[PDB]
């Protein structure tokens, strides 16, 4: 499996790894005009999940199942045992981690699901290396506590940081700075964003190019910034690839 | 899903210097002539985009007047058009008419110049953002090694730096010309070379040029599309302190490119 480990957490080891993510998920994906990839969709359940590993400062690992559809969690094993979110596709189970005890989390792989049943947002979740580690730490052992949060940092980390080169770099920079950070308005409005950005687009193909609806994106100074067709740098060289929406 | 068939989107359209796209003194006259202007609020800047290729302002028209290059570029009444295959915009921004394949123009940088057609050459003055939101996007731009675009030797040239925060001459202004502009010096733009004999990529004085015209492309590389060549760290060695323009090529990961805003 694709894997990155604490053992070997560069700025280059990382940039790889979320490379080498970002052309697993873009396999067969489709192109309109703007030229960004569009993620797969109708997967036959079987061939649906990308399975990645992540390794602690304790070399404990855990493997996650990306569903290719939606760039989401839908699951992850520690050991012996796998965890599936109740918004897993219903027959992921049979599929992914068969061979072990499964257990079902209580809860969605939403921000949304996950922020209400830990009582923690984002804005208040810290991210980095160390956060990084201690999180692969939590799932692995499957400290009901920390679980939520440990997926707001991996799924932020991994899985946004893939669909946008901003993230990205913002861990970069963390890495390199040997500082963490908490995502600000810029980080949260790409995330919120990403459903509505992929629509647009690929809804922009009839009108030259323009939205029917504007996105606001923020930027680093937290003003925000209207992105109302394909037009704009922060969306076009950010977004890395697209859910699927329009035919 | 209908929200994949959008009817129409009203929004502003802005070029070089960062002017409007503007219906001349708001006239509504077939063959009002449209001009840049300093962006506002006024309806005569508002362009309506629909699903047959038509671009509209005051309920009519954006247009080319001839078949040849150096016409303005008008609004007209739309039934004119009925047969008109209309425009299609570039995902780099430029504007054509599909059938003569004349591209809006601004000749000129000052407020009312007139908008033609022209041929295409690519030149920033040939390009475009279609949207709302007009000011230059501030931004760094990193490359090779996790460094960053700085402005050197008092904003002749350019090379990559260790990335430092709020450091001024590594702040860049994106605009809709599709110019990348010293951030504090905004006369001042990113260059492709004027010498023959060298590819080093400079900073001069901003002039509409095909040199000054930069794309950044989905793939990560920073796009001349007129000379159909890609910003590059000369050797692949940032201690060269040199970017020149190269022909895209995978061999090493100097072609790469991030929009840090
Ligand atoms: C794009 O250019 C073409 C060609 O110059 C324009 O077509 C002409 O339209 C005028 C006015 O309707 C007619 O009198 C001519 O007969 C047309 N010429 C040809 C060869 O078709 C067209 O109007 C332009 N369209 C836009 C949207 O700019
Ligand atoms: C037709 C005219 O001159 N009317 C004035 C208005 O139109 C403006 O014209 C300028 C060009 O000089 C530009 O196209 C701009 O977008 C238009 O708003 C305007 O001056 C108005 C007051 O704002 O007064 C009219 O008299
Ligand atoms: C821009 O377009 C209009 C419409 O065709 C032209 O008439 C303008 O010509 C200018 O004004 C006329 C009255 C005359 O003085 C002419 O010689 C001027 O050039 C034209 N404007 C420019 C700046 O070319
Ligand atoms: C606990 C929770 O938030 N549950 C939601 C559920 O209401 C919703 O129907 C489902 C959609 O698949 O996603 C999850």
């Known amino acids: 499996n694709l894997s990155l480990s604490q053992s070997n957490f560069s700025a280059d080891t990382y940039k790889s790894f979320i490379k080498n993510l970002r052309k697993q998920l873009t396999i067969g994906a489709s192109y309109g005009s703007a030229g960004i990839p569009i993620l797969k969709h109708s997967?036959?359940?079987?061939?649906?999940?990308?399975?990645?590993?992540?390794?602690?400062?304790?070399?404990?690992?855990?493997?996650?199942?990306?569903?290719?559809?939606?760039?989401?969690?839908?699951?992850?094993?520690?050991?012996?045992?796998?965890?599936?979110?109740?918004?897993?596709?219903?027959?992921?189970?049979?599929?992914?981690?068969?061979?072990?005890?499964?257990?079902?989390?209580?809860?969605?792989?939403?921000?949304?699901?996950?922020?209400?049943?830990?009582?923690?947002?984002?804005?208040?979740?810290?991210?980095?290396?160390?956060?990084?580690?201690?999180?692969?730490?939590?799932?692995?052992?499957?400290?009901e506590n920390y679980v939520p949060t440990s997926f707001l940092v991996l799924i932020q980390m991994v899985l946004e940081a893939a669909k946008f080169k901003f993230i990205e770099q913002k861990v970069i920079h963390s890495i390199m700075d040997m500082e963490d950070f908490t995502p600000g308005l810029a980080m949260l409005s790409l995330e919120e964003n990403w459903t509505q950005l992929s629509?647009?687009?690929?809804?922009?193909?009839?009108?030259?190019?323009?939205?029917?609806?504007?996105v606001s994106l923020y930027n680093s100074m937290d003003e925000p910034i209207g992105v109302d067709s394909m037009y704009y740098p922060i969306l076009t060289a950010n977004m890395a690839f697209q859910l699927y929406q329009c035919p | 899903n209908e929200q994949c068939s959008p009817q129409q989107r009203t929004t502003r359209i802005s070029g070089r210097d960062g002017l409007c796209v503007d219906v001349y003194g708001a006239l509504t006259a077939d063959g009002s002539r449209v001009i840049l202007y300093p962006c506002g609020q006024q309806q005569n800047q508002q362009w309506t985009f629909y699903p047959d290729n038509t671009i509209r302002s005051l309920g009519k028209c954006?247009?080319?007047?001839?078949?040849?290059?150096?016409?303005?570029?008008?609004?007209?009444?739309?039934?004119?058009?009925?047969?008109?295959?209309?425009?299609?915009?570039?995902?780099?921004?430029?504007?054509?008419?599909?059938?003569?394949?004349?591209?809006?123009?601004?000749?000129?940088?000052?407020?009312?110049?007139?908008?033609?057609?022209?041929?295409?050459?690519?030149?920033?003055?040939?390009?475009?953002?279609?949207?709302?939101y007009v000011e230059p996007i501030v931004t760094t731009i990193i490359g090779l090694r996790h460094m960053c675009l700085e402005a050197t030797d008092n904003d002749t040239n350019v090379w990559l730096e260790s990335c430092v925060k709020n450091k001024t001459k590594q702040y860049w202004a994106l605009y809709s010309d599709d110019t990348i502009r010293v951030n504090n010096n905004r006369n001042?733009?990113?260059?492709?070379?004027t010498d023959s004999s060298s590819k080093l990529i400079v900073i001069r004085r901003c002039d509409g040029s095909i040199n000054q015209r930069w794309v950044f492309t989905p793939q990560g590389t920073i796009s001349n599309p007129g000379y159909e060549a890609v910003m590059d760290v000369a050797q692949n060695d940032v201690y060269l302190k040199k970017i020149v323009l190269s022909s895209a090529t995978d061999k090493g990961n100097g072609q790469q490119w991030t929009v840090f805003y």
Not at chain 1, 69 to 96: L, W
Not at chain 1, 103 to 113: G, K, L, P
């Open chain 1, 43 to 143: 997967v036959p359940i079987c061939e649906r999940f990308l399975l990645v590993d992540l390794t602690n400062g304790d070399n404990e690992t855990i493997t996650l199942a990306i569903n290719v559809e939606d760039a989401g969690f839908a699951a992850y094993r520690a050991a012996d045992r796998s965890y599936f979110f109740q918004n897993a596709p219903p027959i992921a189970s049979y599929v992914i981690f068969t061979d072990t005890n499964q257990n079902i989390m209580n809860f969605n792989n939403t921000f949304e699901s996950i922020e209400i049943v830990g009582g923690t947002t984002r804005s208040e979740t810290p991210l980095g290396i160390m956060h990084f580690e201690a999180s692969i730490f939590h799932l692995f052992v499957h400290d």
């Open chain 1, 199 to 214: 629509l647009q687009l690929q809804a922009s193909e009839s009108l030259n190019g323009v939205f029917g609806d504007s």
């Open chain 2, 188 to 193: 001042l733009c990113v260059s492709s070379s």
């Open chain 2, 62 to 132: 954006l247009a080319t007047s001839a078949l040849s290059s150096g016409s303005n570029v008008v609004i007209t009444n739309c039934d004119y058009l009925r047969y008109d295959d209309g425009w299609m915009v570039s995902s780099s921004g430029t504007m054509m008419n599909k059938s003569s394949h004349l591209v809006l123009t601004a000749n000129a940088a000052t407020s009312r110049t007139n908008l033609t057609g022209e041929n295409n050459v690519f030149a920033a003055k040939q390009a475009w953002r279609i949207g709302n």
